[PDB]
Each structure stands twice: as C-alpha cells, then as structure tokens.
Amino acid sequence: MEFIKGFTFGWDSQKGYFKTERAKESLRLMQERTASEYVIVALAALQDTAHSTEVDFQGSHMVDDDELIELIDYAKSLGLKVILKPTVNCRNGTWRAHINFFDMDIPGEPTWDEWFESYINYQKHYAKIAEKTNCEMFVVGCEMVQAERREDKWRELIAEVRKDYRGLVTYNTDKYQEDNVKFWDALDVISSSGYYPINDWDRQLDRIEAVVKQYDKPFFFVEAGCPSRSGSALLPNKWDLEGAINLQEQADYYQVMFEKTASRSWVGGFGLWDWQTYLYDEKDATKNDDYGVFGKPAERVIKAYYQSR
C-alpha cells in the first residue's frame, strides 16, 4: 500500500450539498492547497439516542445516492482516490463511541441484533455505492468503542460488506483503542483516529507500533488533525474545546505530528480532519477556530509534507 496523503471531506454535508458548484469548488481547493491524493468522504447516518435501533440514512441530514455518485465521480475525475466512510451520529448529541446495549437480550429492551440489523443494512447500501464507483477503500465503522466487543457482529457485517464490495475494507477505531479491536484479521487495513497530544507522540506511536507489528497489514491514521484553539494541541479530538482562536497552535500540532510520524514506516498515511463541503471564505480563515486548514499556516505545513513523499 502506498502512503495515503488523505483529507476528509463532506462531514458537514446534508441532502443536496453534493449537487452544488461550491461543493465541487471546495474539493478542488482541498486538493490544490493540500496536495492530498486521497479524499475520505465521511457521512453520518442518524439514530435517535445511543441506545436506539433504527439507523436513518434517508433523511435531510444525508446526501442522496445520485449526488454522492456525482461527487465521488468528480473526485476521481480530479485524479483523487476515494475512501468511503459511512458512520452514525445520535440526534441527542451522544458521541457514537457510546452506542451500546445489554449483553443479554431482555424482553422489552433494545438488543445488539436489532442495532446491527439496521447498521448492516446501512453499511451494505453504501458498500454497493463504493463498488459501483470503484472506491479504493471502505471503512465500515468509526470510533464505535463500546460496540467493538461484539466481534461476532462486526465480522458478520464485514462478511456482508464483502458480498457487495471487492475493495479495501477497514474499521476506524478511536484514539488509544488500536488494540481494543479483536477483528483486524477480518479486514485489510488497520486505522484509528490518531488524535494524540502534541507532547505524547513517542509513547503512543511506540504503543501502536507493537500492536500493528502483530498483523502484517498496512495501517494509517484515517482520522487526524487539530482545531486552531488554545489547548487544542493537547486534546485535538475535542471538537467543542473551549479556547481562544490560535492558528499557530494548529500549525505546531501538524508540524510535530509529521516530524514524529515520518520516521515510522508503518504509519501509512492520514485521513486529515477535516475539509468542509461549504468552505468558509478565505478572508475569514484567521478568525476560524475549527479543524479547517484552508487559509491557515497549517495548510502550508500539510501540503509541504505531502510533497515530501
């Protein structure tokens, strides 16, 4: 596997976003300003709470199949490779790492089999799209920490995805959880959200290196990045961190992340987080405290390193 110079796209998208010209424009800017060669198209189905059972991918929150195929087709037209990442959020705000049910099946109660029935049908639907558009990779889940223990149901899901998609298949685990997943053998690539503190890269990379050396599969940080806020470089996963705007902090994180990881040949790339479909105007970049790199010093750090290799 080649080093994945990737960037995440579309996380802000709702139904209709991908029909628009500005969506196509945000994508080209992302390729030109970053030198990304892969785009990770991250989408979010909806379920009501962390313990609901119906996973909704048809509502206004979700792009339609045709505008998704247009957008992927466009990315490939720009010369991009495409990684398709369909995940789930909760309407009540709960981070999906908490989706979880009783180990036992209780009569009046939601079960793992119900949630996996819906989530697998969600997954199969976009596996079919990943195959017909020839996506290079498909990531069947994202940061499902409390659900990772159901390795039986995940392999069932993976099996169902393989019936629909011939390509590379991975699961996206959370920071510090790279070894929590006991089903990497059923997959082709290992990937985590590498939101690691700016002062802790040596210890964490060393920990992950021992884990991936057991598997003989490529690995990459399918999520990684940092808001431009004071305090963000210590907790870069915290999207809602409270801090003053700080563009240098974001660039410093990126600069150290690449220094620390360029030495590990097993770090197989990044899905940097994240590039919005509806991009803010450049004039506004210096006032943006968010993950975006457009028009910030970090934009130049990322492209320079993606040039490096």
Side-chain angles (χ1 to χ4, degrees), residues 6-53 55-225:
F7 222 110
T8 304
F9 186 81
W11 183 242
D12 61 324
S13 83
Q14 305 169 68
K15 194 175 307 286
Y17 272 41
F18 286 177
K19 291 216 50 60
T20 72
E21 165 66 20
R22 67 170 307 188
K24 302 176 165 61
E25 219 264 313
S26 161
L27 183 52
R28 305 177 291 251
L29 282 168
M30 180 242 274
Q31 163 186 54
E32 150 205 303
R33 308 288 274 263
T34 287
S36 278
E37 300 168 0
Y38 285 64
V39 51
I40 288 77
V41 170
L43 312 169
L46 282 186
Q47 68 191 66
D48 285 346
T49 68
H51 322 288
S52 320
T53 279
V55 168
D56 184 336
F57 60 92
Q58 282 199 324
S60 51
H61 59 285
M62 181 76 59
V63 304
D64 278 337
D65 299 340
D66 57 1
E67 54 167 329
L68 177 58
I69 291 153
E70 292 177 44
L71 193 272
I72 293 169
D73 280 2
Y74 193 57
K76 286 177 310 159
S77 90
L78 291 181
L80 290 167
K81 301 196 191 186
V82 173
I83 302 180
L84 188 47
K85 178 173 156 157
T87 184
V88 175
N89 293 334
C90 301
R91 289 187 179 87
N92 69 358
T94 312
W95 179 33
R96 68 200 155 252
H98 293 317
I99 282 159
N100 198 8
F101 309 82
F102 289 3
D103 302 347
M104 294 208 285
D105 284 6
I106 310 301
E109 227 47 55
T111 75
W112 275 111
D113 284 351
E114 310 176 317
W115 185 86
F116 260 101
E117 170 63 38
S118 184
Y119 188 76
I120 283 167
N121 273 274
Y122 172 45
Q123 288 302 308
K124 280 182 73 66
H125 176 95
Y126 289 95
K128 284 191 182 61
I129 289 165
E131 165 82 17
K132 165 185 18 166
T133 66
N134 293 320
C135 289
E136 282 65 25
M137 198 182 303
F138 187 78
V139 53
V140 298
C142 182
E143 302 172 352
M144 300 308 272
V145 183
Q146 299 288 29
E148 277 160 358
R149 62 173 207 272
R150 300 296 319 232
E151 54 84 20
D152 51 329
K153 303 300 277 156
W154 282 104
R155 294 172 191 277
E156 187 187 333
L157 183 148
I158 287 151
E160 287 304 312
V161 173
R162 300 279 198 190
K163 300 177 180 176
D164 281 312
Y165 172 66
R166 316 283 140 205
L168 289 183
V169 179
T170 179
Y171 169 81
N172 179 186
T173 193
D174 195 36
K175 63 214 150 68
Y176 308 101
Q177 309 280 350
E178 290 91 352
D179 200 29
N180 197 50
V181 166
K182 302 310 172 189
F183 53 89
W184 293 123
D185 78 270
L187 293 147
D188 305 306
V189 177
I190 305 155
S191 73
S192 57
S193 297
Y195 293 121
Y196 290 118
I198 187 185
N199 61 345
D200 208 24
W201 275 110
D202 289 322
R203 155 171 106 181
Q204 301 306 327
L205 290 182
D206 283 355
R207 165 180 65 71
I208 300 162
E209 185 182 315
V211 180
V212 315
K213 235 65 152 154
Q214 302 166 10
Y215 281 95
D216 170 63
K217 305 180 172 294
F219 159 95
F220 76 127
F221 282 119
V222 64
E223 272 188 47

